[PDB]
């Protein structure tokens, strides 16, 4: 990231820091945990609304020194008040401003927020899961602020979990108890902390919502398969994401030794002599380095982390994830609470700034058997029938007679996004109670209010609503400012929040008290259906068939003659 959106982000986290002291308030409050008592305060919002807020709640111990790459503990209790008037720090991790290495290990926190402790009904409980591909993310108010969700009568709460290698290595020898995916670990944790605690916050305990962006959508779909979280919340939603991407799991048990080698090991190739180094390295050299754990052939065939969710080598306690996603989906007690999915126009615009380091990928569009579905490719990718494949991909995206940077960002938005959501709907279709799941598409573009992510897709500029464009208008941020309220941008943070505590509150998105929705008919998706219906929202919001379909059938067709992988 440039030398010119490192100072001017810098700014920003001085006026950010200024502007936070200002909205703060005198008037700190004490509500229960079942761990203790804690502290909150009141704060402003830019639009003179305010909220109580109670931040850095512990919910599990601090994964330090010997609980290090370890499923977390309960945290210990205290007398007393603790002090909960102040963000705690992120997961350690690279900041994608300045590439340097921020965060700590001890990161293990939730965030409280309402605008009322003592409402005379109980309300909406609504879980935030961050996204940032289980590698950077955070719950601090400079990136996600509750400002516009506390304008509603609901309780919401933004979590943090463990990242990148500290989250979710995975070592095979059943002995080190190593056995993958912490972070979601602590995600369950903190579910269950809040399905005990919220009541004391004025939240229903048996009206809870999860949802999240990206990982944090993968995350919250991880939450509805597996069986640890069984009945801890009631619906679901999931932006852009799901457990079945294809950078959403990864098999990384040989990944330690890579990590071990990098970090400067001396010895051999087995878990336990690889454990006890990567045990007592420094966080921040483990965590700068796994950028260059990754294989060249492992980036060409598509693997985007080398650290993540993982199939869980052998079971234990805590174990999230004995089976390969597309098994758990089939037993899930999460396919039968009321579900909402959706995805942005233009998803893969995201990795503009990645075409401009790589103009050699568009190359790959010349076959594009470098995005076949893996479990479909040969190693190599060179079979007749992986170039068989690869055209049935080239003839959904390549438009004319070389491929394009727009081409190659089509193509993105369903490898990554759509495909994954339709593999997903057909598979849950098969194996569900009938409980609705309802779509919609993010259509909204406006350069006049953005995010943090559009610095790192380096989005200046750009028309388009990519991936992550939509976060905007949920949350507040530090580049964001007053709108008038009349603005588009305006109506859209009202339409947008207005929609999400609506199913929050009734497992049915639609409302008649929200501007533009007295014409639309919001039908759920059914098992019968060729087309999927979705909400478009825009300027206007409108029901239409899903205009990625056609492409999505195409990818499809992939599986003609192997309709067992589907």
């Given at each position: 990231?440039?030398?010119?959106?490192?100072?001017?982000?810098?700014?920003?986290?001085?006026?950010?820091?200024?502007?936070?002291?200002?909205?703060?308030?005198?008037?700190?409050?004490?509500?229960?945990?079942?761990?203790?008592?804690?502290?909150?305060?009141?704060?402003?919002?830019?639009?003179?609304?305010?909220?109580?807020?109670?931040?850095?709640?512990?919910?599990?111990?601090?994964?330090?020194?010997?609980?290090?790459?370890?499923?977390?503990?309960?945290?210990?209790?205290?007398?007393?008040?603790?002090?909960?008037?102040?963000?705690?720090?992120?997961?350690?991790?690279?900041?994608?401003?300045?590439?340097?290495?921020?965060?700590?290990?001890?990161?293990?926190?939730?965030?409280?927020?309402?605008?009322?402790?003592?409402?005379?009904?109980?309300?909406?409980?609504?879980?935030?899961?961050?996204?940032?591909?289980?590698?950077?993310?955070?719950?601090?108010?400079?990136?996600?602020?509750?400002?516009?969700?506390?304008?509603?009568?609901?309780?919401?709460?933004?979590?943090?979990?463990?990242?990148?290698?500290?989250?979710?290595?995975?070592?095979?020898?059943?002995?080190?108890?190593?056995?993958?995916?912490?972070?979601?670990?602590?995600?369950?944790?903190?579910?269950?902390?809040?399905?005990?605690?919220?009541?004391?916050?004025?939240?229903?305990?048996?009206?809870?919502?999860?949802?999240?962006?990206?990982?944090?959508?993968?995350?919250?779909?991880?939450?509805?398969?597996?069986?640890?979280?069984?009945?801890?919340?009631?619906?679901?939603?999931?932006?852009?994401?799901?457990?079945?991407?294809?950078?959403?799991?990864?098999?990384?048990?040989?990944?330690?030794?890579?990590?071990?080698?990098?970090?400067?090991?001396?010895?051999?190739?087995?878990?336990?002599?690889?454990?006890?180094?990567?045990?007592?390295?420094?966080?921040?050299?483990?965590?700068?380095?796994?950028?260059?754990?990754?294989?060249?052939?492992?980036?060409?065939?598509?693997?985007?982390?080398?650290?993540?969710?993982?199939?869980?080598?052998?079971?234990?306690?805590?174990?999230?994830?004995?089976?390969?996603?597309?098994?758990?989906?089939?037993?899930?007690?999460?396919?039968?609470?009321?579900?909402?999915?959706?995805?942005?126009?233009?998803?893969?615009?995201?990795?503009?700034?990645?075409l401009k380091q790589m103009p050699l990928?568009?190359?790959?569009?010349?076959?594009?058997?470098?995005?076949?579905?893996?479990?479909?490719?040969?190693?190599?990718?060179?079979?007749?029938?992986?170039?068989?494949?690869?055209?049935?991909?080239?003839?959904?995206?390549?438009?004319?007679?070389?491929?394009?940077?727009?081409?190659?960002?089509?193509?993105?938005?369903?490898?990554?996004?759509?495909?994954?959501?339709?593999?997903?709907?057909?598979?849950?279709?098969?194996?569900?109670?009938?409980?609705?799941?309802?779509?919609?598409?993010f259509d909204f573009d406006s350069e006049?209010?953005?995010?943090?992510?559009?610095?790192?897709?380096?989005?200046?500029?750009?028309?388009?609503?990519?991936?992550?464009?939509?976060?905007?208008?949920?949350?507040?941020?530090?580049?964001?400012?007053?709108?008038?309220?009349?603005?588009?941008?305006?109506?859209?943070?009202?339409?947008?929040?207005?929609?999400?505590?609506?199913?929050?509150?009734?497992?049915?998105?639609?409302?008649?008290?929200?501007?533009?929705?007295?014409?639309?008919?919001?039908?759920?998706?059914?098992?019968?259906?060729?087309?999927?219906?979705?909400?478009?929202?825009?300027?206007?919001?409108?029901?239409?068939?899903?205009?990625?379909?056609?492409?999505?059938?195409?990818?499809?067709?992939?599986?003609?003659?192997?309709?067992?992988?589907?």
């Amino acid at each position: 990231v440039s030398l010119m959106e490192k100072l001017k982000w810098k700014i920003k986290c001085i006026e950010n820091k200024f502007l936070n002291y200002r909205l703060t308030t005198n008037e700190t409050v004490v509500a229960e945990t079942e761990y203790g008592k804690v502290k909150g305060v009141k704060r402003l919002t830019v639009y003179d609304d305010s909220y109580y807020s109670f931040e850095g709640i512990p919910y599990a111990q601090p994964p330090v020194g010997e609980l290090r790459f370890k499923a977390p503990q309960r945290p210990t209790p205290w007398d007393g008040v603790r002090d909960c008037c102040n963000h705690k720090d992120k997961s350690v991790q690279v900041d994608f401003i300045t590439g340097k290495v921020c965060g700590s290990e001890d990161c293990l926190y939730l965030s409280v927020y309402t605008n009322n402790l003592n409402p005379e009904t109980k309300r909406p409980v609504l879980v935030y899961i961050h996204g940032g591909g289980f590698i950077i993310g955070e719950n601090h108010r400079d990136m996600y602020g509750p400002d516009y969700f506390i304008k509603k009568d609901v309780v919401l709460i933004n979590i943090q979990y463990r990242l990148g290698a500290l989250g979710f290595l995975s070592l095979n020898s059943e002995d080190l108890n190593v056995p993958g995916n912490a972070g979601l670990k602590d995600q369950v944790m903190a579910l269950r902390w809040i399905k005990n605690n919220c009541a004391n916050f004025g939240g229903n305990p048996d009206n809870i919502t999860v949802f999240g962006e990206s990982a944090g959508a993968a995350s919250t779909h991880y939450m509805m398969l597996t069986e640890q979280t069984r009945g801890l919340f009631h619906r679901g939603i999931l932006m852009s994401g799901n457990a079945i991407c294809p950078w959403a799991n990864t098999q990384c048990q040989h990944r330690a030794f890579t990590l071990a080698k990098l970090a400067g090991y001396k010895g051999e190739d087995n878990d336990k002599d690889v454990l006890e180094f990567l045990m007592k390295a420094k966080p921040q050299d483990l965590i700068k380095l796994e950028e260059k754990v990754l294989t060249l052939e492992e980036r060409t065939n598509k693997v985007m982390f080398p650290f993540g969710p993982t199939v869980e080598p052998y079971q234990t306690a805590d174990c999230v994830l004995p089976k390969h996603p597309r098994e758990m989906v089939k037993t899930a007690w999460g396919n039968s609470i009321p579900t909402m999915m959706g995805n942005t126009s233009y998803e893969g615009l995201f990795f503009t700034s990645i075409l401009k380091q790589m103009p050699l990928l568009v190359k790959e569009l010349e076959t594009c058997v470098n995005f076949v579905p893996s479990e479909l490719a040969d190693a190599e990718r060179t079979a007749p029938e992986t170039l068989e494949m690869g055209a049935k991909i080239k003839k959904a995206h390549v438009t004319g007679e070389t491929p394009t940077a727009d081409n190659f960002m089509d193509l993105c938005s369903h490898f990554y996004f759509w495909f994954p959501m339709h593999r997903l709907l057909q598979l849950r279709f098969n194996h569900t109670s009938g409980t609705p799941v309802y779509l919609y598409r993010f259509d909204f573009d406006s350069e006049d209010l953005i995010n943090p992510y559009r610095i790192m897709r380096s989005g200046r500029g750009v028309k388009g609503v990519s991936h992550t464009d939509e976060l905007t208008y949920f949350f507040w941020n530090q580049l964001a400012k007053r709108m008038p309220k009349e603005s588009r941008e305006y109506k859209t943070i009202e339409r947008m929040t207005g929609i999400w505590t609506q199913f929050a509150t009734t497992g049915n998105p639609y409302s008649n008290e929200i501007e533009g929705m007295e014409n639309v008919s919001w039908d759920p998706i059914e098992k019968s259906d060729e087309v999927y219906k979705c909400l478009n929202i825009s300027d206007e919001l409108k029901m239409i068939d899903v205009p990625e379909m056609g492409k999505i059938k195409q990818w499809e067709s992939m599986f003609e003659k192997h309709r067992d992988l589907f």
